[PDB]
Design a protein around this motif. Sequence first.
Motif, PDB file in Angstrom:
ATOM      1  N   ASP A 173      -7.269  -5.356  -1.589  1.00  0.00           N
ATOM      2  CA  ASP A 173      -7.214  -3.979  -1.207  1.00  0.00           C
ATOM      3  C   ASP A 173      -5.995  -3.240  -1.738  1.00  0.00           C
ATOM      4  OD1 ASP A 173      -9.636  -3.935  -0.024  1.00  0.00           O
ATOM      5  OD2 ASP A 173      -8.860  -5.053   1.721  1.00  0.00           O
ATOM      6  N   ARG A 191       1.693   4.095  -2.394  1.00  0.00           N
ATOM      7  CA  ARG A 191       1.186   5.454  -2.097  1.00  0.00           C
ATOM      8  C   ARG A 191       2.263   6.476  -1.777  1.00  0.00           C
ATOM      9  NH1 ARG A 191      -5.246   5.571   0.304  1.00  0.00           N
ATOM     10  NH2 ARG A 191      -5.896   3.791  -0.897  1.00  0.00           N
ATOM     11  N   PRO A 203      -5.049  -6.012   8.771  1.00  0.00           N
ATOM     12  CA  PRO A 203      -6.335  -5.453   8.456  1.00  0.00           C
ATOM     13  C   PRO A 203      -6.659  -5.397   6.970  1.00  0.00           C
ATOM     14  CG  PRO A 203      -4.822  -3.701   9.152  1.00  0.00           C
ATOM     15  CD  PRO A 203      -4.211  -5.047   9.535  1.00  0.00           C
ATOM     16  N   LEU A 204      -5.681  -5.226   6.102  1.00  0.00           N
ATOM     17  CA  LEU A 204      -5.855  -5.161   4.655  1.00  0.00           C
ATOM     18  C   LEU A 204      -5.678  -6.544   3.995  1.00  0.00           C
ATOM     19  CD1 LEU A 204      -5.346  -2.088   5.417  1.00  0.00           C
ATOM     20  CD2 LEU A 204      -4.452  -1.804   3.145  1.00  0.00           C
ATOM     21  N   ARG A 216       0.785  -1.196   0.000  1.00  0.00           N
ATOM     22  CA  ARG A 216       0.000   0.000   0.000  1.00  0.00           C
ATOM     23  C   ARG A 216       0.837   1.275   0.000  1.00  0.00           C
ATOM     24  NH1 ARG A 216      -6.149   0.807   0.187  1.00  0.00           N
ATOM     25  NH2 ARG A 216      -6.002   0.824   2.454  1.00  0.00           N
TER      26      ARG A 216
END
Lengths: 189, 189
Positions: B122, B88, B117-118, B84
Motif C-alpha cells: 500500500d 504524502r 491497517p496498511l 505513507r
Amino acid sequence: SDIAFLIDGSGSIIPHDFRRMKEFVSTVMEQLKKSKTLFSLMQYSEEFRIHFTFKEFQNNPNPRSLVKPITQLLGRTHTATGIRKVVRELFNITNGARKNAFKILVVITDGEKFGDPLGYEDVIPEADREGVIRYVIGVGDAFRSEKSRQELNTIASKPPRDHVFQVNNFEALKTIQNQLREKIFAIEG
Amino acid sequence: SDIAFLIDGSGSIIPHDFRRMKEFVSTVMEQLKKSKTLFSLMQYSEEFRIHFTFKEFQNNPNPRSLVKPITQLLGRTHTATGIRKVVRELFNITNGARKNAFKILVVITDGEKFGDPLGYEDVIPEADREGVIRYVIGVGDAFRSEKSRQELNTIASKPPRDHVFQVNNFEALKTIQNQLREKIFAIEG
C-alpha cells in the motif's frame, strides 16, 4: 449468494436510530433468505466487530436471533478499512464463504469516512477483483452535500444510480426494503 | 537533496536509547550538511509527529537544536502508515520539498509492523512512484531472524545489501554512522 452487511455503529447514531437500523437488517435477511443464501455481519466504526459469518449463519440461520444482541460502538467512521476487512475476512473461505457464489455487500452509513489511514483507492480495487457487488444505503443530512453523495456514489458498484439509496433518517429505511430486496434477487432470480 | 528521517517512537524503546537514537540523528544531519540539503523528521508509533518540515529546517538549520526538544510518543509500531505520510506530507511542495531534488529517506526502528491497517504493498509503490530512495536501520533483537529482517528488505530500496543496516543496540548505531554518511553522498557527489 454470500450476502454480507457492513453496518455503521457510529456514536452519531442515537440509540433508537441504531435500534431502527438494526430492525432494518433482520427484515431484509428474512426477506432475501433463499435456501443456499448465506449471511454475515460486522459493525464498524474505529473499532471492528464481527457479529457473525456465513459459516455460523448456517448452524443458526435466524436473523432475529443473531441481530438482536448487538452492542453499538460509538467511535468514528473507517468505512474504507471496514471494506477491506469485509473482503479480507468475511468473504474468506474458512468463514463459510463458498467459492462459486455471488458475493454481495450492503453498506449502511451515517456520514463521511473520518480519520481512516486507508482510502477507497486502497480497498475498492481489491473488492472488484474478487468481484463483490456493492450496494449502499446512506442515511441523513450529512449526505445532502454535492460531495457527500460523491463518497456514496463511490463505495457502490457501477452504475451508482442503481446501487445508491439516499434516505432521510432511520425511520425511513423501511421505505426501500422492497427495492433493495428485489435488486438482490434479480441476480439469482 | 531533500533528506528525511522516520524514527520509531514505540514503547519498547527505553528512554536513554531514545536519547541515543536522537543523538545519532543530529550527528548524521550535521555530517551530511551542504548548502543545498534539507532534512525532515517524523517519529511514528500509533500516532505520528512532524518535528520539522523541509521549509521549516530552512528557518533553523540547527539539527541539534531542532532535535533537543523531541519527546517520545510511546505508541506501538505502524511503519507503513508512516511511510505513507513521509511520502504524502514531507516530500510535498507546500512542506518545502524541492522539485528537481533527490529524495532519500532513512527508516530507524526496533520493531515489526504491528496492528497496522496498511501493508507495505500500500506504500512501497507510492514511494517508488515518487523517487524515494529508502535506507533502513533495524535496531535490536526484533530483526534477529531470517524472517523479521525480511521486513527490512521490503521497506528498503533494491538491492537490499546496500540499503539495509541492523545493529544489536541503540548504542552500536555509531558503528554504521560513517558507512551511512557516505552512501548518501554517492547519490550526489
